[PDB]
Design a protein around this ligand. Structure first.
Ligand SMILES: Nc1ncnc2c1ncn2[C@@H]1O[C@H](COP(=O)(O)OP(=O)(O)O)[C@@H](O)[C@H]1O
Ligand SMILES: Nc1ncnc2c1ncn2[C@@H]1O[C@H](COP(=O)(O)OP(=O)(O)O)[C@@H](O)[C@H]1O
Ligand SMILES: Nc1ncnc2c1ncn2[C@@H]1O[C@H](COP(=O)(O)OP(=O)(O)O)[C@@H](O)[C@H]1O
Lengths: 37, 370, 370, 375
């Protein structure tokens, strides 16, 4: 984080969300094939 | 003398590796090398210029896929040797190649120079105790538990039918055709481009291969399903986009039964099976019709059995009983055979020792194979 | 000499300079030269015809502001050289340029002659031990500590999006647009003239820049606020006079999403981000939407995240998860990245030595740029 | 029955991605050639007696280009915007071009090979439903070029603005499995050149300015016999004069931009090079024909007009081709108009009377009618 170190700087964004994200929403065949004469 | 021999099925599509006695191959990975196409700029990136198996499956988009072996013939030996080096890596098996003997399963009617070069690698690079090369067809029957029977093995690389009597393969009745699973995937790609879905990249062709395996049906009547309007079933691509496959689903896999579609003047897979039996002596034909075994990956298409049985009836003689046996584990029939053969005490006499190879050379593997 | 390398973030608005190992840039000053327009009559006046940084900030009214660099391209090298001379002055850092190595951070897809001339100065004028030019996007990844991620850096000079996967930068997927923070301030000024507030002077335009940074919000629905006509927010000028900004507050910054407003036939910032991802291979597209990193000063507008996320969702595929990560230190992320890269032991191999430059010349820095 | 609407002189329409070439069967040259894009005015009309209409096509859009925003309706020989393409086909029968009734004259359209079936299917519906045309015949680009040259046998390497493809045809027999087409074409080279001009420091953001980049490409771009030799050496920067009067120094971008045709890896597309496409298409054919196909090579399309194209292609083909094989590359002087002249000859031939599909047959069988009796 290092907030007291970046705190000296004028252009540090605060009171904003860090991440903007979208809402979370929600057998082979056998053998035995035969035919008689 | 050793602890336990390692069975390695050198399949065109996927390499199946495990120990003799194992019920299933523990380590199965695709038989291709993936190299990163994009430039590395940032530190702590993916290390190495070579990715094989699950590492290449996860980061497929980054890599350029090159298959070292086509129609069961190794074009690039440097890549093929590196893949066999990966077989003994920490990911797969994780054992010493000098400690365990090896059983390799090669396609029928291959050149002798392939077996000679293959043998050199495992005795020189890997200093293997003993090497035994085995046929794909004979092992498939050992797994099924039948001594006599015709093996229709339609693989990723090549399709072949071997009539085998009491464990002996009739060298004159063997019929092999270059057309295989890889040709259906390329042949499907031609229909997807005409429908308006482009997959130019080698990484994109692996999605077409996944689409081919997922959505393809073998129509009982070709013309009937061609004339009827399809539902145009949608498939979800990795990115999230949906494609409508439509008539291309069942029109692509027809190539196996009609080689005229790609323009190759060969017999259909159903003609191969019947023709191979008709070449054999009159006394066995009836037994060979009674004992038909299906193998290979391209047999897994839905309705393959019902379509093949109908096609065999047209080509087969009248008043002949046709019994086609398809094991549930079609893909693993060749490997399971190798596991059984390796477990038999006779296997100690069958394989070629490193010492015998050094003495006679290429002759050693030709004498105790043929 | 193996002293701490000096990181210089060559921003169009403000130059951020410090030594490798420092958490924050100790010395940040505006990137313009101020020359006195008024006549000196009295003795004991401000000495010098050139004022840079805090001396120009305090006596702004006396000075005429001229920006040497526009859209990340140096128009006047004489002025920029005096500013780079000021970086080594008694006010900022106060060190010898021949003792410390230099790390420069340039924008992507800059002219070849711009980088070439900049390098000549640091090898000829300044006898620097070694020089390494780095990308703005790659340094942002060191800062965040992620190898994979799309870096949408919207600066004062230029806006660009560079998609990088596991430390691999796709050079064909980079999208750069001239429209940036400085152009929005000029576009805002046009609305103040329509309201009846004149700011002709270069010193007065800096007040319009201060108004832009103070009072501007990006509305989720543009048309709603245009039709609504909300209460005109009052701003207090340096002298004490009050101006009513009114609808110009939120209508001016819209330019980022609608370039048609200024009349430039370019893509919007939300289109640039999505289009740059859509250019990537199918496998990576989903991951790149999942890993989006915002940087640059022009992202600091209130409701930027909410507006961009909505616009990206409209263009992006359906049912794909979009997670946009914006560091609180957006402005200072690029510099601290340069500090990390310079701190790495590997960096000694990365830079070009003064001797290496003298031998091969411009060719050396042209090869070892990426 | 005798004086039907079928006995009118058929109109040939070459559906080119870059330029549409229109004329009557029997005409020596295409009389009406205009660019294949729609121009709409971006600026606002304030004063009376201004340029009337929101749509400008051909010479009206060429003269007032700065005013208009250019949008191409067709990309890689596939119609992206059908509404715009219909307005262009309506303009083909306007008072400016041809000036005839679409229901009176039959039409011959020339589409690229290996196009989508829905693209051709939708195009046909327009010419049967919107335009009450007597008869429509879709023809291949390759076969028409051979009618023009007057050769039954020959490999047609047609590198157009939209797509590049090679069709090997032997004694009037087209091998449908040997046809190879790649999306990379003249229009993509202009975008690739634009990237080099920005690196030199010349910006052309506007759609109207992109037409100047195309004009720069056509004027100053040469295909070097050795790429790397000219890449490593610093060449003399040739100066180009812009419409306004300003001068730009183009420099090494001249030969670095057009290389894309032989090296698709430059734009990042993992496709075959133009020299590989030609040789690979021949190598797919039977042994008996391979030698004849190398002996009979025909160049077509606009993208062959680059300086040293012939010398570079021959060198690249020779490296890939078998040793001691005779390679004869045939280039007609009228490369651009070779496809159209073919359509004029084919339509004029008596045999054509059986080839075209009637409106009645289309209404009965539908899409089946136009999908049959083609290729
Ligand atoms: N479910 C499936 N349906 C259809 N074809 C399949 C299916 N699964 C795999 N295949 C095909 O079978 C191939 C696998 O064959 P493979 O196991 O390599 O055989 P062998 O090793 O004996 O040559 C795949 O590459 C694919 O082409
Ligand atoms: N709070 C703010 N709200 C909106 N815009 C801001 C804010 N703070 C700074 N800016 C804009 O961002 C710019 C800073 O750009 P910067 O990131 O320093 O440029 P560069 O990328 O060239 O280093 C300022 O000049 C101003 O236009
Ligand atoms: N002299 C030239 N040198 C290089 N390229 C050219 C030249 N003249 C035209 N071209 C390119 O060729 C294109 C013309 O292609 P064209 O033959 O009309 O193809 P199609 O008819 O398939 O659309 C132009 O748009 C341009 O890109």
């Amino acid at each position: 984080m290092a907030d007291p170190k970046y705190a000296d700087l004028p252009g540090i964004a605060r009171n904003e969300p860090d991440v903007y994200e979208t809402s979370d929403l929600p057998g082979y065949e056998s053998g035995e094939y035969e035919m008689l004469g | 003398i050793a602890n336990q021999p390692v069975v390695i099925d050198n399949g065109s599509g996927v390499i199946k590796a495990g120990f003799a006695g194992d019920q299933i191959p523990k380590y199965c990975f695709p038989n291709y090398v993936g190299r990163p196409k994009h430039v590395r700029v940032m530190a702590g990136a993916l290390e190495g210029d070579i990715f094989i198996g699950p590492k290449a499956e996860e980061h497929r988009g980054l890599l350029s896929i090159r298959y070292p072996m086509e129609h069961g013939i190794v074009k690039d030996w440097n890549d093929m040797e590196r893949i066999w080096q990966y077989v003994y890596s920490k990911d797969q098996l994780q054992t010493f190649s000098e400690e365990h003997p090896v059983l390799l399963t090669e396609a029928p009617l291959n050149p002798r120079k392939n077996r000679e070069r293959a043998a050199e690698v495992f005795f020189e690079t890997f200093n293997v105790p003993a090497l035994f090369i085995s046929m794909q067809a004979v092992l498939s029957l050992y797994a099924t538990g039948r001594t006599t029977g015709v093996v229709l093995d339609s693989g990723d690389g090549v399709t072949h039918a071997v009539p085998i009597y009491e464990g002996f393969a009739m060298p004159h009745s063997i019929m092999r055709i270059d057309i295989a699973g890889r040709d259906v995937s390329r042949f499907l790609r031609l229909y997807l481009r005409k429908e308006g879905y482009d997959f130019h990249s080698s990484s994109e062709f692996e999605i077409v291969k996944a689409i081919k395996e997922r959505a393809c049906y073998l129509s009982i009547n070709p013309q009937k399903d061609e004339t009827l309007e399809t539902e145009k079933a949608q498939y979800y691509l990795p990115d999230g986009s949906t494609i409508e496959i439509g008539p291309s689903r069942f029109r692509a896999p027809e190539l196996l039964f009609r080689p005229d579609l790609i323009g190759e003047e060969s017999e259909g897979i159903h003609e191969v099976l019947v023709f191979a039996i008709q070449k054999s002596d009159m006394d066995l034909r009836r037994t060979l019709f009674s004992n038909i075994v299906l193998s290979g990956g391209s047999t897994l298409f839905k309705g393959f059995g019902d379509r093949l049985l109908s096609e065999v009836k047209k080509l087969a003689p009248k008043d002949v009983k046709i019994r086609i046996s398809a094991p549930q584990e079609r893909l693993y029939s060749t490997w399971i055979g190798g596991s059984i053969l390796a477990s038999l005490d006779t296997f100690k006499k069958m394989w070629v020792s490193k010492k015998e190879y050094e003495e006679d050379g290429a002759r050693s593997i030709h004498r105790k194979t043929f």
